[PDB]
From a paper:
The MR solution comprised one Kif2A-NM monomer bound to the concave side of a curved assembly of two αβ-tubulin dimers arranged head to tail and capped at the plus end by DARPin. The final structure was refined to a resolution of ~3.5 Å, giving electron density maps that show well-connected main chain density for all subunits of the Kif2A-NM–tubulin–DARPin complex. Notably, the N-terminal section (residues 157–195) of the neck of Kif2A can be seen interacting with one of the tubulin dimers (labeled α1β1; buried surface area = 915 Å2). The other dimer (labeled α2β2) is occupied by the Kif2A motor domain, which contains MgAMPPNP in the active site. Residues 160–185 form a well-defined helix (α0a) that runs antiparallel to helix H12 of β1-tubulin. Many of the positively charged residues in α0a juxtapose the large patch of negatively charged residues on the surface of β1-tubulin. The Lys262, Val263, Asp264 triplet (KVD motif) of Kif2A interacts with both β1-tubulin and α2-tubulin at the inter-dimer interface. Val263 inserts into a hydrophobic pocket formed by the non-polar atoms of Tyr262, Pro263, Arg264, Ile265, Asp431, Glu434, and Val435 of α2-tubulin, while the Cα and Cβ atoms of Asp264 of Kif2A are nearest to Tyr262 of α2-tubulin and Lys402 of β1-tubulin. The most striking change from isolated Kif2A involves a ~26° rotation of the α4 and α5 helices, allowing L12 to engage helix H12 of β2-tubulin. In contrast, the tubulin dimer bound by Kif2A’s neck is much more curved (15.3°), and there is an even larger bend at the inter-dimer interface (15.8°).
Kinesin-13 proteins are major MT-destabilizing factors in higher eukaryotes and a specialized class of motor proteins in the kinesin superfamily. Rather than moving directionally along MTs, kinesin-13s catalyze tubulin disassembly at MT ends. Human Kif2A is a 706-amino-acid kinesin-13 that functions as a homodimer in vivo. A monomeric motor domain construct that includes the kinesin-13-specific neck (Kif2A-NM; amino acids 153–553) exhibits the ability to catalytically depolymerize MTs in vitro, similar to that of the full-length dimeric kinesin-13 as previously reported.
Numbering used by the authors:
A (entry chain D): 1 to 44, 47 to 360, 369 to 441
B (entry chain C): 1 to 41, 46 to 440
C (entry chain E): 204 to 213, 218 to 326, 335 to 423, 430 to 552
Amino acid sequence: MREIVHIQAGQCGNQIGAKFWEVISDEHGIDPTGSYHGDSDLQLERINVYYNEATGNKYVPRAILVDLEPGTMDSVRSGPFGQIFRPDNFVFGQSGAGNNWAKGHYTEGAELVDSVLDVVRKESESCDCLQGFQLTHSLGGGTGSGMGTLLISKIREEYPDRIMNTFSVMPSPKVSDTVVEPYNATLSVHQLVENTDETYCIDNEALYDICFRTLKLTTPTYGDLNHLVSATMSGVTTCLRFPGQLNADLRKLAVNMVPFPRLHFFMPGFAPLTSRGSQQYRALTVPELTQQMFDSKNMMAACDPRHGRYLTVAAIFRGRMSMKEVDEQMLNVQNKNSSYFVEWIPNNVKTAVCDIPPRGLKMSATFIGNSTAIQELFKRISEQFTAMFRRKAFLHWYTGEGMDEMEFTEAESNMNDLVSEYQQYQDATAD
Amino acid sequence: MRECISIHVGQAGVQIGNACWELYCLEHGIQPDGQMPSDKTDDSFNTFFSETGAGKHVPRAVFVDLEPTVIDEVRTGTYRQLFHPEQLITGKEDAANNYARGHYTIGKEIIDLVLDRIRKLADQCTGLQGFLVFHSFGGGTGSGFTSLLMERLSVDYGKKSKLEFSIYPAPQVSTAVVEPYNSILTTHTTLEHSDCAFMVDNEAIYDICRRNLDIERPTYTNLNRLISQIVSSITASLRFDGALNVDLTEFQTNLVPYPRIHFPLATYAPVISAEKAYHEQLSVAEITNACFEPANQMVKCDPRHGKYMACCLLYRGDVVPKDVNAAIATIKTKRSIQFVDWCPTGFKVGINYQPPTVVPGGDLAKVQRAVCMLSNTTAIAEAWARLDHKFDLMYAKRAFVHWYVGEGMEEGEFSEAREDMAALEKDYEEVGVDSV
Amino acid sequence: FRGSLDYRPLPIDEHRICVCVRKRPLNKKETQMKDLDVITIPSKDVVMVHEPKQKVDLTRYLENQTFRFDYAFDDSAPNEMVYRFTARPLVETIFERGMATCFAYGQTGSGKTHTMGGDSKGIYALAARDVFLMLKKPNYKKLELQVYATFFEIYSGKVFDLLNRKTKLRVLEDGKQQVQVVGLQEREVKCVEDVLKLIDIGNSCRTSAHSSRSHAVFQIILRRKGKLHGKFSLIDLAGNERGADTSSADRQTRLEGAEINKSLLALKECIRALGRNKPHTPFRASKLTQVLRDSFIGENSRTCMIATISPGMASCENTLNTLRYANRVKE
Ligand SMILES: Nc1nc2c(ncn2[C@@H]2O[C@H](COP(=O)(O)OP(=O)(O)OP(=O)(O)O)[C@@H](O)[C@H]2O)c(=O)[nH]1
Ligand SMILES: Nc1ncnc2c1ncn2[C@@H]1O[C@H](COP(=O)(O)OP(=O)(O)NP(=O)(O)O)[C@@H](O)[C@H]1O
Ligand SMILES: Nc1nc2c(ncn2[C@@H]2O[C@H](COP(=O)(O)OP(=O)(O)O)[C@@H](O)[C@H]2O)c(=O)[nH]1
Ligand SMILES: [Mg+2]
Ligand SMILES: [Mg+2]
């Protein structure tokens, strides 16, 4: 297991994919044009995990970029490291969804899907040990949610033995203009619970809260968040871009993380917290690093884990520090809060350490938390949704595009059983 | 000869295998190119090594890992020339800490060349004793492909012996949550085949390198070196031949009173820092005393509250039979050492006269005389019950089962393997009863 | 053992499910390579297993598990006999405005298909014929019930309609009520030899190592004014296959077996969930569970489980799992 093929679609999804490829193309040492300008070979032992090699010291990001809006691609060309993308891999539609799921799933996405499948095909025809597929998108809009879920379904029925990883973001009436979002959300969840393997959850509400209270940015722009997400992405991909025994490939990653097939919704978190282009003079230590990255003030989804219990956790520390200090603080948080861990799964928190730190930091810490508290995030949507589907607003959009209307209440019964599933494994003692 | 054949599976088994053959070359005197100064191109070491044409002495080992990153270090390291290249067999996708991918999906396609190559080694020999299998109880590769591999070796080589070297997982360096599942599975399927399984608590090795070597966070390297030294003590009675050492198959017979009770706790005598210098050599009596302290033990357990069924002492270095007998007198009654009423309280001793060669810069302080005791005690059942607890919470809610079933296996295999485990525990009980 | 026994006979309890077990006799393969029979049934109420155990000291002894049930069919009785007490007292249900079902649970080689899909005097055919013989009767005809039938398979975690030659169907819920099998062709019949025709449409349209590799659902539906009144399902599942029995590799056969054992795992965890009542029973785990939801917790539902087990020593592990879950079913 080595090669990971990456894909970005939708406004939000393409944006965050760009931020990702920026920070990781710098950390791996690739210059903007596409030649290795690093220092340490630690950045090339597992470089093949995210780049194909065009002969001649050309590191081509094994990636694909899609949108139903013909514009979008412009924001790519202005991306400072955007020329490195392979020409064939640019597949951009020209209709546009306009915040409509069924337009992206049953209508126009149904037309561009087979155009993406062929570039994905010729991407897999040149991979030694193709791991799985790794996607970035958003749930409240039109293109990303729908066309994404359809793509995942077709890849799933053509590649059943390859890991299915998705980095999905959340709508909330704090950043979303329109309010057609509590529909596309529940649809996307309906497909994700049934077709994906791993799934990372990022709430726009959390990023707004962090940008306002911590970073003191009263007027949050739309890149202020992409910074915050790209950081977490480097943190959780460290286990796959650098060598190490823990979380080698994605299969191993899900193995120590997925207790039940459906429950696979994580709540990332990073410490410390910084704005853009602002380094840390008093860079953080260790007890504040782990004392922060397990508190809620640094989590990436609007979910207070102190209400729920952790099923599994995978902590990752980057930089140069003491190993004993790491494992000691880990177990200290564990046993001083053994009331927050399912005692019927033991050895549930796995922590690795990587040498190379992220950019702008000397010591960092990433968090990945499959908690039982994540149901609070799904009890919110099934509230914005049951309050809008009991009224049937905007249903002529979807239903008037080949969609069944009951494929909605299907998703309400599905998610409302999921909530009961996270509540199930919250009070089950080891009897 | 009376040949043997080593097999090394999984990350652990391959790395610890490299430490083992490292030490073998050091003690028996071979340089990484495979050449020996003293030999004539039928000796005690010609059981573990074969002679080629140009005196290029080459091991009798097959290395396997499903993900070639851990074996590629062999072909890049100092011993890349040492090996016949055809017996460094590798896969592509690691088993991903999944037993079922070892035993069924991934291993099926590679087992046949694994055994055509093991075959290619077996046709080199004139009278092979048995296979030495090195693997971990944890990772998917070492559990699955060893369970299947043994299921096959029992078909192709029924008359031959099969000795396990097993690596109990420690929570500190555990790379998975589902380690109990893998362990229980491979023990269940491997039991009726394997003849004698030496168990290594990684927790215990960690504690050893915490106390006597004073390393705060010991690397996998340190652990592999220590374990290698102990294995060299055990095999030494196979690889040398004085008039004072007997075959490991000679007193293997005395270590296993019942077919399912074949797990001898090991114990290794002097373990001292080469850094923390200034040291007086220990007498035979002192190391024979140390062979009974749970510190210098191999598995985390407590033999003082448990009964014994046998005892072996493999001394290496400077040891006179009378020194051993005297130390055995000082130990015999002076301690609360108990035998079952159905067993003679006798000791057999393998005096090997080669000293313990440690490692260049290897933080094992070199010593003149050492002892490695193999005690088949009933307290070893502790290490099983430490498993079946971490198991019987998870399997109480069937958490994580969906992967193993999702790669081929049924559910009932779990309830069966677990039930068989509890049966084994009750057997380590039935050993303790007496008569009248 | 075997003989020199059986003085005592069977006075049972009140169940929530007609749980029954069938023993098939050994065949040419298990006899040529002389396997042993380790199952006996002395009364139509007791399933005995002779678990060959061995102490630590190699002394061979017998763990004589005893399993009382609703009815125990031995290694002789034909499809008629099994139908008469498993599916027959269930025809009463659907005519009286009821929703009944019928399970075929066992291992691969236990005989589920042969009890349901015949060769073709299977409980499909027989149950249908007793549907059309009572619909002749005066007090049943005075309802003017129109008869329908469906026949579809779950394979690879997706739904395909065998009457509509392997077409993909969705599966939805909505307003609670029912689990709506969206897209299902519902063919009208008015006589027994219509049903036999649909039957040999599906039985040959099924995916098939000569064994039923997909979950078969065969419905017999009643509609008075068109509105639903009765629904009897007859289910032939795939057996819980070992995995320790190595298939000849194959890239799709391992897919099949794995998905089978995973659906059976989900079903199994739902059994062990109802047996102790977890307020969240995990029915949205697989398509199969999502289906059988109403077959269990339906408002006016009855149901029947026909368990099947092999008699050979080699099967004893599987057999004990199947019987153990059949015991945990009887509530
Ligand atoms: N003593 C020792 N133990 C090890 C070593 N490597 C792994 N382990 C143990 O093995 C367990 C994990 O299994 P691994 O051997 O790493 O996995 P694997 O055999 O390579 O199988 P895959 O990871 O699926 O490829 C952990 O609990 C470790 O304690 C090692 O080098 N030395
Ligand atoms: N009552 C019976 N008497 C004799 N043979 C029987 C009986 N019931 C079943 N069999 C035999 O069982 C064999 C296997 O039947 P079948 O039901 O297809 O296996 P299975 O349980 O369905 N395995 P699977 O296809 O995975 O569900 C048939 O070929 C019959 O010969
Ligand atoms: N953090 C962040 N959120 C975004 C961005 N773009 C869109 N969103 C969110 O995603 C939702 C849908 O917007 P959009 O991306 O245009 O829809 P889509 O592309 O069709 O999925 C909105 O509610 C936004 O809050 C972005 O660049 N950053
Ligand atoms: Mg490996
Ligand atoms: Mg069948």
